[PDB]
C-alpha cells in the first residue's frame, strides 16, 4: 500500500517515506510519504485560497448536504475503513465495526446537522438619545484549521476535529498520527470522490518535531490548532502558535480514577472497571489507571477483577472472542513494559499480568502485553501518578467519601472519572466534586456528541462537542447597529 | 509608603517601591510597593486556600449579594475613585465620572446578576439496554484566576476581569499596570470593608518581565490568565503558561479602521470619527487609527474633522471644557512622537497636530501630545499598519466597496471596525465581511456587557462578556448518569 | 378517484362521502369519505394506544430517521403530490413544484433534525441543609395531537403541524380541509409504506361544524389542538377544548399591511407588493390587503402596480407564463365577489379588476376572480378592516412615519407586515413598532423555519417554528432531585 | 379597616363593599370595595394608556431598578405584610415570615434580574439572489395583563404573576381573591410610594362570576389572562377570552400523589409526607392528597405518620409551636368536612382526625379542621380522585414499580408528584414516567424560580417561571431583513 498526501485536490508523494507497521505481527503494511515544509506551505495556502472559492459561497444547507455526502462515502466503503483501521493499530474488528468507523460517520453527520440548526444572539439596548441600538452576533469560519490527531482512535479523533471544522465553513490542513495513517488517507479519497472542492481538505503525513506536525503549528497561515495527544506535546504546540496568537483547543489525556463505593452493584462495577481499564488495550485517554474501592469490598473486588481479567482473550483482531489486540507499536510497548518493571520496583503486588503473552506464532513478532492489575502502591508512586496508556490499573482501598474525592483530585491531571454507586444522593453529590471535565456514574465512555468534552489542569484547555465545537471552529462576531 | 499589596486579607509593603507619576505635570503621586516572587507565591497559595474557606461555601445567591456589596462600596466612595483614576492617568474628570467609575461598578453588578441567572444543560440519550442515560453540565469555579490589566482604562478593565472571576466563585490574584495602580488599591480597601474573606481577592503591584506580572504568569497554582494589553505581551504570556496548559483569554488591541460611505450622515460621521480617534487621547484598543472615506466626500470630511480636532481642548482634568488629557507616561509619549516623526518620514501630509502643545506651565513637564490627522500615506506605511495608541488617525479615500473591505481586512490585527452608512443593505452586507470581533455601525464603542467581546488574528484569543465570561471563568463539567 | 380515511394503519371508507371539486373547471375529482364521531373516536383511541407501542419505544435518533423516511417517500412521488395539490386547488404547477411540495418535505426534515439536536436545562440550587438540589427538565410527547388544517396551502400547512408533532414523539389525528383532501391522503400512503406504526398517524376527512373537525376538537382523548384557519373558527375551537383545558396553538390570518416609504426602491416595492397581494391568488394568511405608500410616490406606485397586475396571467395551472389560478371554490369566490361589490358601495375607486375574467371555455365554470386594486377608501371601511382572502389590496397615501405606524397597528388583527425602505435606521426603528408577529423588510413571506411564527391580537396565540414548536408539541417536565 | 381599589394611581371606593373575615375566629377584619364593570374598564383603559406613558419609555435597566425598588418597599414594611397575610388567612406567623413574604419579595427581584439579562435570537439564511437575509427576534410587552389570583398563598401567587408581567414592560389589572385582599392592597401602596407611574399597576377587588373577576376576563382591552385556581374556573376563563383569542396561562391544582418506595429513608419520607400533606393546612395546589407506600413498609409508615400528625399543633397563628392554622373560610371548611363525611360513606378507615378540633374559645367560631389521614379506599373512590384542598391524605399500599406509576398517572389531573427512594436508577427512571409538570424526589415544594412550572391535563396549560414567564408575558416578534 502507498499512502500519499492530499494537497489542493491532488494526491502527491514526497521526497521521503516511512514505514507503517502492523503491531499484530510487525509486518510492513505501507510506505507513507512525509510532507516537508514546502508541501505544508502548499497545503495551508491552498486552504486559504479555497476559503475564497466555491466552498466559501455554499449556503449552510448546501455545505451540510455535502458533509452528509462525505459521511455517505465512508458508509459506502464501511468495511474498507474497518480493515484500514484494524491493520494500522491491531484493534479488534468488532471494535472497529461498532465504535471506530460508526463514530467517524456520526461525527460528520452530527456537525452537519448542527451547522443547519445552530443560530446566534440578538441583544437590544437603550442609548442616551432614546433611539436605542441592537447587537447581533454571527458565526463565521475562523479560517484555516490545523488538525493534529493521535493513533489510539485514528478515524474517530481525526473526524472529531475535521467534521466540526468543515461544518463551520473552515478549510483544513490535517496531520494524522504517523502510526495510523491509513483511514485518514481513505477519508481523503472519500472527500475527493464526493466532490469536496480542492484546497478545502488537505491531508499531510509525517511526524511531529522537525516534520509536518511541527511545520503545521508554525505556519502563520492557520487560524487555529486543535490537537488531541500527550499533554507535554500540547504545551509545545501552545508555545509554537503563541507568536500568531492562534486559537487553540487541546485534549491531553490524564490519569483517570474509577471509584467503587460500598453500595455499588459489585458485579456491574467489576465489569465496568474491566472495560474502563482494558478497552483498546488501555489505549484510551479516558481509561481508568487508578481505581479506589471501599475497604469493605476491596478484596472481593480485586478477586473478581482478577478472574475477569484472566478471561480476556488477547490476540488477532478477528480472533473468536477476542477482547484485546496488541499495543500500537513496539516503541509504545517499550514504554508500557518499563512501567510494568517500575511498578514492581515501587513495591507493587502484581495481581495478574505484568508481562507479555507467548503465542508461538507471528503474534510474537507483534506488540502485545498482558492486561495487568496492581495493588499495594502509595498515592505518590510514579505508576499511580503518571499516564501509562496501557492495559493496566492499580487498585487501592479507601474508607471515606471526602477522603477518596481528595485522592481522586490529587493529580496534575483531570480528564475523566467513573463512579459506581447505587445511591441517588451519592451519585450527584460526589460527581460534582470531582475535578475533571467528564464524570460517568455506573458506566464509562458513554458519549452523547452534544456534550462539552475536555479536561482540566494538564488534561487540556477548552471544550469541544455540540455548541462548544460550533463556537471554537467559528469567528464569533458582534455587530452593533445604532438606530 | 502609599500603595500597598493586599494579600490574604492584609495590606503589605515590599522590599522595593517604585514611583507613580502624574502625567499632567510629571510630579510624584505615590510610592508603590513592588511584589516579589515570594509575595506572588503567597498571594496564589492564599487564593488556593480561600477556595476551601467560607467563600467556597457561599450559595450563588449569597456570593452575588456580596458582589453587589463590593459595587455598593465603590459607589459609596465614587469621587475618591474618580480622583484616583484621574491622578494616575490625567483623564478628564468628566470622563472618569461618566465612563470609568460607572463602568467599573456596572461590571460587578452585571456579573453578579449573571451568576444568579445563568444555568446549564440537560441531554437525554438512549442506550443499548433500553434504559437510557442522562448527561447534565455544571459550571464550577476554574480555581485561581490570574488577572493582568493595562493602564488605559485602569479600573474599568481591571474590574472587567475581576468581576466575572469572582462571580463564577473563583479566587483572584490581580496585577494592575505599574502606571495606574491607585484605583485597584482603593478597590482592595473596598473588598476588605465589604468583608470579602481573606485570600479571595489579592492585589499585587509591579511590572511585567522580571516582576510581579511575569511571576504571576509562571506560577503553577493559577488555573487561568486573563489579559488585556499589547499583542506581543499576549504571546509572551501564552508561552509562559504553556507548561501548565492554563486557560487563557486575551484582548490585544489592533489597528482599527473606520469607513465612511458617501451616504453617511456626514456631520455625524465626523463627530463619530473625532470620538473614535481621540477619546482618552487615542489610548483605547478600539480607537480608529485608520480611516477610509469615499472619494466624493473625502475633502469635506478631512476639512470638517480638522476643524473639530482643532476645537479639542487639551489640558487639565478639571479644566473648563476639557476634551483630552495627556498620554499615560513620558515613555508612551516618546513612542507616540517616534511615530509622529516616522509619519513625516513616510511622506505623510500633516493635516493637524504632529507635535506637543506648548502650555507654558507645569503641563509642559507632563506627557501631552496634540491630536493629529494624517493624509497621503500608502496602505503599507508603518504608521498605517502598526498600533500607535495615540490620538491620531490617517484618512485615505476609497472608490469601491469591495476595495475598502479588502483594505480594512488587510491587516494582522482584527479588533474592531466602525462603518458609517445610512443604507440598510450596505450596513449588514459590509459589516459581516469585516474580519474583526466587533463592528459598530453609525456609532463607536457602544457597549452592552452581554455581548461577545474580543478580536481575531493578533488582536486576541477567545471572547469575554455575558455567557462567554461565565464559560471562560468556569470549569464546564459534564456528568453522565447511566440509568 | 376515491379518498379514504386512514385509521389505525388501515384505509377505511365511511357511510357518507362528499365531492372534491376542481376549481379550475368545476369538475368532480374525487369522492371523499366523511369520518363520523365514531370513526374520530377510533382514531383518537388508536393514537392513544400507539403511544404505548413500538412508536413510544423508538430512540430520538430512530424516530428522526423514520421521519426522514416519510420525507424521502414524498420526494419519491414528488410529481404525484404536485398533481394532487394542483387538482384540488388550481394553484399554478410552478408554485406547487417550488413552494408547496418542497416546503412539505423540508418541514419533516427540519423537525426530524430538531428532534435530534434539541436539549433541555439544568438548574443547580442551594438548600437549607447545605447539600443543595438539582432541577432538570425533559421534553416528553404531549400525547395525541389533533391537527386541523386549511385549504390555502394544503400539504405545506398540514405538514407544518404534523412534522413537529411526530418529531416530538406524539401520535396524531389530523383533519385536512374538505376543499383539499388529496395530498393529505397521499401523505397517508407514504406513511404506511414507510412503516410508520399503526395508530401513530391517523387521517380523518370531513368538515368542521357537526363533522370530523368538531368531533376531533371535542374528544377528551387528545392532549392538544393546533389549528390554522379563520380567526372566528379559532375562537370556536378554543371554547370547544376549554372543559378539557387542552393546549392550543392558533394562527388565524389577518389584515396585513405593506408600507412603502419615500426612500424605497420603487420598482422592487411594486414587484414586492405585487407578490404580497396576489400570490396564490391572494389566498395566503400573510398577504397584504392594505398598502400604505408615501404621498410623494403614491401616484407612480399605484400606476406601476396597475401595469404589473394587468400583466399577470390568470389561467390554467400548467398554462405558459401563468401567475394566478382560481380561488379555492365557488363558495369562496361568492365571499370575495361580495367584498368586491362592497368596495364599490363603500366608495372605492377600482384601479383594476373588481370582477371575474371571461374565458369562453370550461374555466368559466371554475372559480376565477381578477386581481383587484382599490383606492380611496377610509381606514374604517369594512373592505379595509376585514380579511377578504382574495387577490386584492387597497392602497392609501401617508405623509408621516408615526402616522402610518399607527394606521398599520389600528387593527383587530396583527399577523404580518411588509415594509419597504433603503434606510438602515428606518428599517429597524419602524419594524420594532409594528404590532404583529412577523415583519419583512424589502421582501415578503421569506421563511427560515427556525423562527417563531405566529400572530398577535385576533391573528393567533402561541408561536410555532424552531424551538417554539418543540416546546408546544412537548410536555415540559421539571424534575427536582434533593441531594 | 377598609380596602380600596387602586386605579390610575388613585385609591377609590365602590358603590358596594363586602366583608373580609378572619378565619381564626370569624371576626370581621375589614370592608372591601367591590370594583364594578365601569371601574374595571377604567382600570384597563388606564393600563392601556400607561403603556404609552413614561413606563413605556423606561430602559430595561431603569425598569428593573424600579421593580427592585418595589421589592425594597415590601422589605421596608415586611412585618406589616406578614400581619396582613396572617389576618386574612390564619396562616402561621412563622410560615408568613419565612415562606409567603420573602417569596413575594424574591418574585420581583428574580424577574427584574431576568428582565436585564434576557436576550433573543439571530438567524442567518441564504436567499436565491445570493445576498442572504437576517431574522432577529425581540420581546415586547404583550400589553395589558389581566391577573386573577387565589387565596391559599395570596401575596406569593399575586406577585408570581405581577412581577414577570411588569418586568416584561406590561401594565397590569389584578384581581386578588375576595378571601384575601389585604396583602395585595398593601402592595398597591408600595407601588404608589415607589413612584410606579399611574395606570401601570391597577388593583380591583371583587369576586369571580358577575363581579370584578369575570369583568376583567371579558374585557377586550386586555392582551392576556394569567390565572391560578380551580380547574373548572380555568375552563370558564378560557371560554371567556376565546372571542378575543387572548393569550392564557393556567395553573389549576390537581390530585397529587406522593410515592414511598421500600428503599426510601423512612423517617425522612414520613416527615416529607407530613409537610406535603398538611403544610398551610393542606391548602396548596401541590399537596399530596394521595400517597402510595410499598407494601413491606406500609403499616410502619402509616403508624409513623399518624404519630407525627397528632403531634402537630393546631391553633393561633402566633401560638407557640403552632403547625396549622384554620382553613381559609367557613364555606371552604364546609367543602372539606363534606369530604370528611364522604370518606366514611365510601368506607374509609379514619387513622386520625376526620373532624374539627375543640378549643372552648373564639377559635371555635373560626374554620379549623383536623389534619386527617385515611386508608382503605379504592383508586376510584371520589375522595381519592377529587381535589379536596384540605389537610388530608389517603394512604394506599402498592407492590410493583410499574403498577404504582400507572396508579399515579391514572388521574384527570397532573400537577406534581413527590417520590421517595434512595436508589439512583429508580429515582430517574420513575420520575420521567410520571405524567405531571413537576416531580420532586426526596423533598417537596422545593422551588428554583427559573424552572418551568405548570401542570398537564386538567392541572393547567402553559408554563411559567424563568424564560417561560419572559416568553408568556411578552410578544415574541420576528423581524426579517432582506439584504
Ligand atoms: N489592548 C489594550 O487595551 C492595550 C493597553 C495598553 C497597552 N497596549 C499596547 O501595548 C503597548 C505598550 O504598553 P505597555 O507596555 O504598558 O503594555 P504591556 O502589554 O507590555 O503591559 C500591560 C500589562 O501587562 C503587564 N506585563 C507586561 N509585560 C509582561 C510580561 N512579560 N509578563 C507578564 N505581564 C506583563 C504590564 O505590567 C501591564 O500590567 C502600547 O503602546 C500599546 O500598543 C494595548
Ligand atoms: N389563517 C389562514 O391561513 C386561513 C386559511 C383558510 C381560511 N382562512 C379564513 O377563513 C375564511 C373561511 O374559510 P374556511 O371556512 O375554509 O376556514 P375555516 O377556519 O372555517 O376552516 C379551516 C379548517 O378548520 C375546519 N373547521 C371549520 N369549522 C370548524 C369547527 N367549528 N370545529 C373544528 N374544525 C373546524 C375546516 O374543516 C378546515 O379544516 C377565509 O375566507 C379566510 O378569511 C384563513
Ligand atoms: C397562512 O396562510 C400561511 C402559513 C404559512 C406558514 O405557516 C409557514 O410556515 O410558512
Ligand atoms: C399552588 O397552590 C401554589 C403555587 C405556587 C407557585 O406557583 C410558586 O411559584 O411557588
Ligand atoms: Na501502524
Ligand atoms: Na502614573
Ligand atoms: Na377541491
Ligand atoms: Na378572609
Amino acid at each position: 500500500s502507498q499512502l500519499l498526501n492530499y494537497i489542493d485536490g491532488n494526491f502527491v508523494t514526497s521526497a521521503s517515506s516511512f514505514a507503517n507497521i502492523n503491531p499484530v505481527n510487525g509486518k510492513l503494511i505501507s510506505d507513507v510519504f512525509e510532507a516537508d515544509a514546502k508541501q505544508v506551505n502548499e497545503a495551508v495556502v491552498a486552504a486559504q485560497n479555497a476559503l475564497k472559492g466555491p466552498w466559501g459561497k455554499l449556503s449552510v444547507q448546501d455545505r451540510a448536504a455535502l458533509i452528509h455526502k462525505i459521511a455517505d462515502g465512508i458508509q459506502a466503503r464501511f468495511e474498507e475503513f474497518v480493515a484500514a483501521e484494524v491493520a494500522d493499530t491491531g484493534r479488534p474488528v468488532h471494535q472497529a465495526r461498532t465504535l471506530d468507523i460508526p463514530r467517524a460517520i456520526a461525527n460528520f453527520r452530527t456537525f452537519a446537522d448542527l451547522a443547519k440548526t445552530s443560530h446566534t444572539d440578538l441583544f437590544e439596548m437603550s442609548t442616551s438619545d432614546g433611539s436605542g441600538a441592537l447587537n447581533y452576533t454571527v458565526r463565521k469560519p475562523l479560517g484555516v484549521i490545523g488538525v493534529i490527531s493521535p493513533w489510539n482512535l485514528p478515524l474517530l479523533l481525526f473526524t472529531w476535529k475535521v467534521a466540526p471544522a468543515l461544518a463551520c465553513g473552515n478549510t483544513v490542513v490535517a496531520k494524522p498520527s504517523e502510526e495510523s495513517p491509513s483511514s485518514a488517507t481513505l477519508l481523503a479519497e472519500v472527500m475527493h470522490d464526493a466532490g469536496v472542492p480542492p484546497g478545502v481538505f488537505n491531508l499531510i503525513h509525517g511526524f511531529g518535531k522537525d516534520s509536518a506536525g511541527e511545520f503545521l503549528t508554525q505556519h502563520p497561515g492557520i487560524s487555529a490548532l486543535t490537537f488531541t495527544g500527550e499533554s507535554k506535546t500540547g504545551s509545545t504546540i501552545m508555545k509554537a502558535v503563541a507568536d500568531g496568537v492562534k486559537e487553540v483547543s487541546f485534549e491531553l489525556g490524564g490519569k483517570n480514577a474509577a471509584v467503587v463505593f460500598a453500595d455499588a452493584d459489585l458485579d456491574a462495577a467489576i465489569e465496568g472497571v474491566l472495560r474502563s481499564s482494558f478497552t483498546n488495550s488501555g489505549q484510551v485517554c479516558l481509561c481508568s489507571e487508578r481505581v479506589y474501592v471501599h475497604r469493605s469490598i476491596f478484596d472481593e473486588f480485586v478477586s473478581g477483577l482478577k478472574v475477569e481479567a484472566e478471561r480476556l482473550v488477547v490476540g488477532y483482531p478477528d480472533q473468536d472472542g477476542v477482547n484485546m489486540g496488541p499495543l500500537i507499536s513496539h516503541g509504545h510497548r517499550d514504554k508500557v513494559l518499563s512501567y510494568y518493571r517500575l511498578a514492581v520496583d515501587e513495591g507493587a503486588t502484581v495481581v495478574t499480568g505484568g508481562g507479555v503473552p507467548k503465542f508461538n506464532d507471528e503474534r510474537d513478532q507483534g506488540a502485545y502485553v498482558q492486561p495487568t492489575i496492581w495493588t499495594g502502591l502509595s498515592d505518590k508512586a510514579r505508576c499511580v501518578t503518571e499516564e501509562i496508556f496501557g492495559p493496566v490499573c492499580h487498585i487501592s482501598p479507601f474508607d471515606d467519601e471526602d477522603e477518596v474525592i481528595n485522592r481522586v483530585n490529587d493529580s496534575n491531571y483531570g480528564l475523566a472519572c467513573a463512579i459506581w454507586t447505587t445511591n441517588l444522593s451519592r451519585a450527584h453529590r460526589v460527581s460534582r466534586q470531582i475535578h475533571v471535565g467528564l464524570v460517568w456514574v455506573n458506566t464509562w465512555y458513554l458519549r452523547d456528541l452534544r456534550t462539552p468534552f475536555g479536561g482540566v489542569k494538564l488534561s487540556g484547555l477548552g471544550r469541544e462537542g455540540g455548541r462548544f465545537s460550533m463556537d471554537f471552529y467559528s469567528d464569533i462576531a458582534n455587530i452593533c447597529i445604532k438606530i
Side-chain angles (χ1 to χ4, degrees), chain A residues 253-257 286 290 405 408-411 413-419 430-440 452-457 459 463:
Chain A
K255 191 73 184 184
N256 312 306
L286 302 171
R290 318 151 42 204
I405 283 163
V408 163
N409 289 342
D410 189 356
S411 177
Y413 297 96
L415 211 214
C417 177
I419 292 160
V430 174
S431 295
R432 57 178 190 197
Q433 300 181 72
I434 309 306
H435 195 196
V436 291
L438 305 153
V439 177
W440 280 288
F453 188 97
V456 307
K457 298 184 280 191
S459 289
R463 294 287 184 273

Side-chain angles (χ1 to χ4, degrees), chain A residues 3-8 10-14 18 32-47 144-149 158 162 172-178 180-181 184-185 188 201-208 211-219 222 225:
Chain A
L3 296 187
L4 283 56
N5 305 285
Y6 179 71
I7 295 166
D8 200 18
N10 296 116
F11 290 95
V12 300
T13 54
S14 288
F18 53 101
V32 189
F33 291 91
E34 177 181 5
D36 53 21
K38 178 177 158 49
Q39 288 181 301
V40 172
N41 180 65
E42 201 180 302
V44 180
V45 168
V144 179
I145 302 307
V147 171
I148 294 180
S149 56
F158 188 86
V162 173
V172 166
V173 179
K175 208 290 282 177
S177 175
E178 60 269 19
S180 55
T185 311
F201 176 74
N202 309 271
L203 175 71
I204 49 163
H205 289 295
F207 315 101
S211 182
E214 174 177 309
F215 307 148
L216 184 55
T217 62
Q218 284 176 339
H219 202 288
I222 67 173
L225 201 296

